[PDB]
Amino acid sequence: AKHLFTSESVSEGHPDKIADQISDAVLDAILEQDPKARVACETYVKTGMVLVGGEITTSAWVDIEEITRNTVREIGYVHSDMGFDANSCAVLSAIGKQSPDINQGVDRADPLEQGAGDQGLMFGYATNETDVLMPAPITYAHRLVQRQAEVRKNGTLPWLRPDAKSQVTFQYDDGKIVGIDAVVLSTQHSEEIDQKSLQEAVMEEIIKPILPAEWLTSATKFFINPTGRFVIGGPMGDCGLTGRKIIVDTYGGMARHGGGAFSGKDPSKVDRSAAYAARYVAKNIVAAGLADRCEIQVSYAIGVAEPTSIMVETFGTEKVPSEQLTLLVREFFDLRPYGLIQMLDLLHPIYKETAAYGHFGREHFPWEKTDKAQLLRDAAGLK
Amino acid sequence: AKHLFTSESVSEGHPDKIADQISDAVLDAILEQDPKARVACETYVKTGMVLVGGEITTSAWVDIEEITRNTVREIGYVHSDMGFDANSCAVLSAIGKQSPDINQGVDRADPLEQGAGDQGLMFGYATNETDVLMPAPITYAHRLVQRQAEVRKNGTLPWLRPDAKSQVTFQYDDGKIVGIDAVVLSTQHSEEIDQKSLQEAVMEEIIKPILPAEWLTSATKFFINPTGRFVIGGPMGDCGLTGRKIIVDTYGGMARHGGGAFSGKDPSKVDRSAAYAARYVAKNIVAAGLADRCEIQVSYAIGVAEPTSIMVETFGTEKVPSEQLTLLVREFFDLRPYGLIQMLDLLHPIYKETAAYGHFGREHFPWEKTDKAQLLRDAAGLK
Amino acid sequence: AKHLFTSESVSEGHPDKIADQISDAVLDAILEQDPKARVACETYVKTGMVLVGGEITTSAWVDIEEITRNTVREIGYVHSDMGFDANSCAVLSAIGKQSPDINQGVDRADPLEQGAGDQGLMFGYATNETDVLMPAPITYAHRLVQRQAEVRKNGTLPWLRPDAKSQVTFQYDDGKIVGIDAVVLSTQHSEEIDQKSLQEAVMEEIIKPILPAEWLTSATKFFINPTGRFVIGGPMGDCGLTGRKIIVDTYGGMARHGGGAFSGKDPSKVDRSAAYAARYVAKNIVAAGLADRCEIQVSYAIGVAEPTSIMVETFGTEKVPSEQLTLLVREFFDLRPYGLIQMLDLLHPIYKETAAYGHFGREHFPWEKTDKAQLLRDAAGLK
Amino acid sequence: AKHLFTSESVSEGHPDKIADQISDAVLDAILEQDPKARVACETYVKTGMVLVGGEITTSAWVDIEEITRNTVREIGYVHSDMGFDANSCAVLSAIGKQSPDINQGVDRADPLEQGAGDQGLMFGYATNETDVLMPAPITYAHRLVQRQAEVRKNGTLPWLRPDAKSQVTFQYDDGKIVGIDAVVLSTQHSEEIDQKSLQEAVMEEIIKPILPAEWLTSATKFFINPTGRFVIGGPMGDCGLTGRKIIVDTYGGMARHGGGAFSGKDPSKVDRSAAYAARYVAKNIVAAGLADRCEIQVSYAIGVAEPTSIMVETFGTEKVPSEQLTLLVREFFDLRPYGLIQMLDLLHPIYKETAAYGHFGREHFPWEKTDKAQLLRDAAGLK
Ligand SMILES: Nc1ncnc2c1ncn2[C@@H]1O[C@H](COP(=O)(O)OP(=O)(O)NP(=O)(O)O)[C@@H](O)[C@H]1O
Ligand SMILES: Nc1ncnc2c1ncn2[C@@H]1O[C@H](COP(=O)(O)OP(=O)(O)NP(=O)(O)O)[C@@H](O)[C@H]1O
Ligand SMILES: C[S@@+](CC[C@H](N)C(=O)[O-])C[C@H]1O[C@@H](n2cnc3c(N)ncnc32)[C@H](O)[C@@H]1O
Ligand SMILES: C[S@@+](CC[C@H](N)C(=O)[O-])C[C@H]1O[C@@H](n2cnc3c(N)ncnc32)[C@H](O)[C@@H]1O
Ligand code: MET
Ligand code: MET
Ligand SMILES: [K+]
Ligand SMILES: [K+]
Ligand SMILES: [K+]
Ligand SMILES: [K+]
Ligand SMILES: [Mg+2]
Ligand SMILES: [Mg+2]
Ligand SMILES: [Mg+2]
Ligand SMILES: [Mg+2]
Ligand SMILES: [Mg+2]
Ligand SMILES: [Mg+2]
Ligand SMILES: [Mg+2]
Ligand SMILES: [Mg+2]
16 A cells, blocks of 8 residues: 655754744743743744743743844854844843733642643654654654754855755555655755755755665655745745744654644643653553554643543554553553653753754653653563 | 544634734735735734734735734724723734745746745545534534634623633544543633633533533533633733644644644645645545545645645545545646645635634635535546 | 013823833832943833833843833823723833943943943033022923822822823013913823813813912913814824933923933933033032023043033123133032042932933932032132 | 033934934835825834834825835945844834824814924024034034045945944134034944054044144044944944934034924924924024024924914024014914925925934025025115
């Protein structure tokens, strides 16, 4: 059974991502000073400005302009030549405090009883398609924009600009990868180099080194800067907003999604924490060998600590009747707001780093670790 | 095989939705004056302001303050008492023009060859779970917030405020719905009514009349304004942004998603047009009885007119080998940028109405129509 | 020799003044925490927002939103009914730090040598026309708006709104006041009261009690809310900006002005400190009886500690040849940046109070005191 | 009787002036399309943005971004190197419409009866110190910044940046100029040139060619970029705002001022039109030889067509008893709102040009013309 699946990714220089980075850059700074802070930060980015707003209630004292300018600076925009400049852009702020009405339902007398930051559903996912138990398409797309950024920073291709996007579509037969049909790579550049040169250079430096030569055949079709010109990019060519990369932030469209963004919010926000916890059990279940691939899904109710719903989907690839596989889940992990935070130790400034190139796949992240696997195994035919 | 699935929806009074409405309110206005306009409008909403920005290149002449004020006004916020007021709020604008670099790849000499507005992937979906071939969870959640809004406007529950959100989780056994385990309904209100009364009133007026009495049992759990207090809402309690309701806008998490928002963009933007066209064939395939449920997926490359990928997933529920089912797709429909726009006649101001309560399910929308079904049938065992 | 002279004033509810208040409100808060802070705060106010920006370099930690909301709150706008609301309006911030390039010229190794914050000229003034040695027209105009504000707060005229402006023109014959020809008083109000009533009420409560009955004759002409309707006011009816009440802030147009605003800046800013010091010597000279009225004028050069120009003008009313009168000035006072601040002890949070109803005329202000007079007398025919 | 008087000016690259230019640039554009438009445009400018706001009620259709970007572009900021860039900066808009409440008092049935845009007082001035009957100090200071700008644009001193300010103080003995004591000239520059070179260059190219060599003696003191470094300037180093150059816009502090700004407002605004009409009669009086120097002052009441106050001050230099000189004023000119506009034909886009380097002194401006002089002479001892 043959079929085609497509995924995509964006460079750290992409408007939307710039936002996320900024958003999560502020939270980290804040958290460093106060772990129990409540941060709901939304960032808007355009031509010559950066808007950092939302609701933040913390005892910490931070500098938004500095965190912002520095964050963009690192991204790469440092001259009007590229369209945006950390040093000369505007930095606006419209940050209020979190509504007490919401807060009474979140932070209650007893810390354990403390409730979900909001209502909603989240999807977790894992697959044995790769070592990091992540789907392949998203993994390679991420690698593509990441490479472009590194070949830019190291000065290999000095004419590359921050803004860039990547798309790849794999060939799936017998349910496994047989190759790659089409490759898309768009990257901002200087008025100094020509399309052909650029195209030819992108192949050698960015695509050829990242895509497995086996999956590349005379069939594969390459799309490099199709409009034929990408000199204008960044916020000037496209408005950047927080939480608009929901899918590339997760599993590339392979798995499902509930609609909750990650960047800008502290862990008491189930959108981010319950999501991480979901990748945590899903991955751990597959590592435990209880299934080849499984999608998990939890849903919550604001101010309520106990999950409103949970469901594990193994697409038949399970090895123990879902029954015990589902009774095992709530048995081993605590999906209650104030259970996942301890479970993954989320009270730390570790999110900025998570704002570009996927929230999953980086084994050093607390939710990528698989310690519960072997124990999740004991609970079912150890041996 | 039993399992639980959860979906959610938001009222037209929800911050994020306010943005979308505004965003799509501007495009419509513009389009009315110029159908071939290029509108990429992003809106940011908070406590006392509304930020309309992005890139717009049109020959039309519109008034952002008026479209905005009027759009919010209709939503409901017209007094400081509710936290936001169309008449007294601030209306900011940061709207530039579309980058010529992008444009050269979109609008080419030959209109047919005209390319995709951007790279990316989109997911279409259909299911025989309901008459409108839409999943059930998203359909009832939408109905819940929609009811709340109507009971508010008609004056049945005058103490209701615009801001509201709804969550419902269904019981799925044997792959069909058996009932509903938990119901969540959060709505903003006045300082005049008490929780109990409120709760009791929400049940009679909003939940009881909308949820099928069959699926409601003594088991069902109801979560009404859990924090115990929701008097503060709207942009004051939560920052609103365009395109952050990606999932409730589509299929509630039942189907997949690529990451493209809808509101604020003209049809030359595949994020909205290829998405619509995808719901179109998926629905049309099920209506054609070629499958009980199928997910479609297309992906594009900026400046390129021909789709980079297409894939139909029928989850085995297909009735004709996928083979002919996939060769039929590209046979009957034109997924090229300037083929879907004619296919669905997208050059009209018909989007604002699509900004609240789902983009799918409203049979009067051009993509909800199923005319190609019977003909899609002829191409496979007519009879 | 008869002639007419007109002056005007504005309520604390006037858009421009709102800005000022806000601007100086931020400074005070900062200064309280750090007296040697460098504050250059500019505020922009419109329909539903408040923009606090400029350059601030301090070690203090303050909350702009709180200071702002509270400052507007106190002014009076607390409902959408009045057009603006401290609780529901937007608060934006674009505050960067002071340029080091300016700083090196201001704060030098030796504190005494420390230079002027900028180049410019300032005008001081004093007149025996009144006990507080202030001109009369500006004194009564201030009193008018101040009364309206007090009759509003105390609940005497509950239908009065914050926004209001006052204009008075005196009759000057033989160089002295003989009466008042025309009176102007514009005040915002509620949709509840009628013009006539309002007008009739404004006379009894605000004008009649404030203007000396002697100067009021059957000739005087009263202009009360001329357009016939002033229900819409505040930032909604008129954009408020910092430093746009330069004249009512000083002497009502009777004396001269160099163009430097007061609110929003710390004392190292000669626009404010040299100005104050100028009223100080001019007042002190008249109190010392060396002249009936004299205008002083100093000018500075950025980064330069020693004044670029000084000139005393006594309009012939002097009693000691200007010569010794000018040599006495630089003899008694220190107009060097770091001499006037000590001279008047300006490193304290005492400016917000100065943001409405005149910077001069309040004898409790450090620059209104006349201690040097008697000593300024000894230096010239004591007896 | 010796004494010192100081005045100052600012380049078209000064933040405040940038605002004014922008503000008056929008009006002209509008007016070009609709002369009877009502424009009250206030601009705020900082680091990477430009805020155009206020209240505008016109039938005209204009592009703020374009007018703005182009206006800044012409000023000179076109690279992040200089701190601001017309191409890459942000352009924001908060423009509402004029309050109808104000309007009913302005535009009434009979166009003649039409009322003053607001209340307030304005000062006109003329002096025989120079051919254009302007005071000397302000004339030379303007020339200084204007020269710097020209030596920058023509490429003479390519390392000069737009931002610059100038200060000059004249020696006045026997009531006439004897020379100049101190000269101040601050200009932004590139990291490429040194202070000494710069200073030495500024003297040859900007000061020496502009200041009369007669007035320059070994006594004169020159202050050139005192802080020792001015590389950072423009909105980055200092916040720009509309109407904050009230004094350099007029007479340099030699004459009086009422507090009304010029830029951003249409002629129905007495702040600008009554101001111009006042320079018109004052200049015309001196030209008519009725006095060596005279200050005029009018005051108005909103919605009221007939001036609330008028007074002419000739400082004894009059040649006809003030009496007939004052009865002549209201005899010859019409200071009613709808009389001055026809008097000077103000319904035209001629203001941008007036936003930098003084509103008076340019004999080609309608208010600089002296046609009524000879006729103002006939009315008093013709011969
Ligand atoms: N290093 C520097 N050396 C000399 N002049 C400078 C330097 N940096 C900035 N300036 C100038 O300082 C100007 C200050 O203008 P000014 O408008 O008078 O300041 P202000 O505090 O805003 N006061 P005002 O508008 O008069 O109330 C800036 O706009 C620059 O032209
Ligand atoms: N209907 C009305 N009747 C009378 N006064 C009004 C009315 N509407 C508004 N006003 C007042 O008009 C004021 C105008 O202030 P003003 O600041 O002098 O205007 P401006 O054009 O901004 N000029 P300025 O700052 O002096 O250059 C407003 O802020 C209100 O206090
Ligand atoms: C829970 S809020 C987002 C979290 C918030 N930004 C914070 O600071 O934690 C998201 C949505 O919940 C709803 N909401 C706001 N206040 C609420 C309350 N007290 N109880 C229930 N729902 C509420 C609104 O519709 C709002 O858009
Ligand atoms: C195609 S743009 C969005 C469409 C745009 N708002 C418009 O007005 O049509 C989205 C992303 O594509 C990339 N992009 C911008 N200009 C491009 C170009 N000329 N060629 C290819 N990709 C480009 C950027 O990374 C940008 O964030
Ligand atoms: C010498 S420019 C005017 C003052 C400037 N705002 C500052 O920060 O000091
Ligand atoms: C009398 S308020 C000052 C003028 C106001 N901006 C207007 O729109 O006319
Ligand atoms: K966008
Ligand atoms: K939010
Ligand atoms: K104004
Ligand atoms: K400033
Ligand atoms: Mg985006
Ligand atoms: Mg959510
Ligand atoms: Mg949201
Ligand atoms: Mg996309
Ligand atoms: Mg004003
Ligand atoms: Mg100044
Ligand atoms: Mg200034
Ligand atoms: Mg005024």
